[model samples]
Target: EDIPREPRRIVIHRGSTGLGFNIVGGENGEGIFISFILAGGPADLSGELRKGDQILSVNGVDLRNASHEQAAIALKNAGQTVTIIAQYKPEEYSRFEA
Candidate 1:
């Protein structure tokens, strides 16, 4: 049951400009996850990125199993424009109806 999923592309500017979020390697080798988001930052403004979101790749480079340092470098070297592909965890819904 290998279903294909699309990745999200996020562009971040240099010179202190960023996606307004913090990222870290997921525990137990689950890929990179969004740790936090700054208020009023590019990520917040986009309203698409969220904490716990998993980064799948950067600038077409797959990061699904990359180390923390590797992922950081990939983002840093993206230059003025950065493209990131990410996947969000599934949202849970209450099955009980009121």
Candidate 2:
């Protein structure tokens, strides 16, 4: 029999101007307005989570209409396992080295 493993915990950080939200040019000559910033993670070490990535959800929950407080509440209620869905640069997975 296999044992169920627990999930990792993470904190959500609000982005700031110049270092937060901004418009980046896409491959099709279109500019995209990116939002949210992920800090303090394995990706943080590799600089995968950049300054202008859009945060789509947390723990499979969409954050479009959810307030920061709501997000915090969700994170708090996530118990021991959680996952964050967001857009950013690609990097190698670092689970055990957090």
Candidate 3:
């Protein structure tokens, strides 16, 4: 059961002043850099991970140098219960002054 599938990739643009990072999908599905979480997927149901969060590791394994296939395998083997370490970028908050 070691079949490989296309991994999800994420595109981010760092704010000019580093205020925050904007998350977007890669161009024409060519980047091939998959994110840690799948939108509305089982992992999202856990409420521990979120969109736009950069995946740092899987099951204590850092993915700094890992490829999409490696990550997919790890995720598949993680089963229903798995630990995903990721980085959350700060977002800009706006308030209304009435």
Candidate 4:
């Protein structure tokens, strides 16, 4: 199912390296989300991206309805500098927590 949400832009500088994160397409390619973050990777250093964040676009191209292969290609072609538009999952609260 497609979940309605807003997008936030995140700029990651690969700097002759990698984004240091992994992503997977949601069911039916409804969306794409961060699956993992490589420690000490470019994305990890930025600390702006998080696992489970839904990616809506890459480099100004909308991927809201893009297939898995399409999204992969977009990311691969994004080059060293990548600008991603995404939606992060809501944080949960605990009543017992201070």
Candidate 5:
């Protein structure tokens, strides 16, 4: 009964930098989240991917329950294409900063 906020599908093309964001959390059954998105990176250019958003899946591999390291592996395993399904909720530390 507790699904996330309206989830959105996002597809990102990886640059030489590999998704251009750091990920944190996802241990102890907590949700996986984006820690930060490097400005001007592909994910940042998408204009929707942002820090604190909940990542549900990447390239169809479920990330919602995966540990942080596992999620990191999944992201890398997907290679050049990163198709992410995510929820738009910001995590505890809001950083849509100026």
Candidate 6:
């Protein structure tokens, strides 16, 4: 029961600013990645969602092949309580943008 590289399923309480996190990916930029987390926001308060995490899907939208716009739109439409599937640290040892 030890599988490597399993996707992390994180639940987020969408605040006034959506997921309270920013994602950067697709559009010739490569895989989806969590770029930033807003301070004191839902995602931040949860402490489970971390920056630099690679997003695999938003709600039901698969981001593995989604462009930045698609991911953005998906997150935007993901109502209040939402769920996110992510690839934890696709780049091992990756650090958040402080």
Summed backbone clashes in each candidate are 0, 0, 2, 0, 0, 0
Kindly list the per-residue Cα lDDT of model 5 for residues 7-90, writing each as its tens digit.
888889998888888887876645788888988888898877777678988988998779988998998889887889988666
Model number with the top TM-score: 5
Q: How many backbone clashes does candidate 6 have?
A: 0
Q: Give the TM-score of candidate 1.
A: 0.72
- Which runs of model 6 end up more than 4 angstroms from their true locations? 1-5, 90-98
Instruction: List lDDT for all candidates, in order.
Output: 0.66, 0.39, 0.40, 0.72, 0.79, 0.76
Best-fitting candidate, scored by lDDT: 5
lDDT of 2 by residue, 22-85 (tens): 2232223222213334354433543434443434455677654565555556545644444455
Which residue pairs come into collision in candidate 1? none
| Tens-digit lDDT track of model 1 for 18-96 | 6578777634535777778888887777667767667888788788888878888887776666666777643310111
Q: What is the lDDT of residue 84 in candidate 5?
A: 93
**Which scores higher on TM-score, 1 or 5?**
5
Q: Hey, what RMSD does candidate 2 come out at?
A: 11.9
Model 4 Cα lDDT, one tens digit per residue, 2-85? 533566778997754467887776455236777788888888887787777778888988887887788888888898889988
Ranking of all candidate structures by their TM-score, best first:
5, 6, 4, 1, 3, 2
- Please state the error at residue 17 of candidate 6 in Å: 2.6
Off by over 4 Å in 4: 1-6, 15-17, 90-98
Q: Identify the runs in model 3 with alpha carbons over 4 angstroms from their true place.
A: 1-40, 90-98
TM-score of 6: 0.81
Instruction: After the best TM-score superposition of candidate 3, give how far the Cα of residue 31 lies from its true spot, in angstroms.
Output: 10
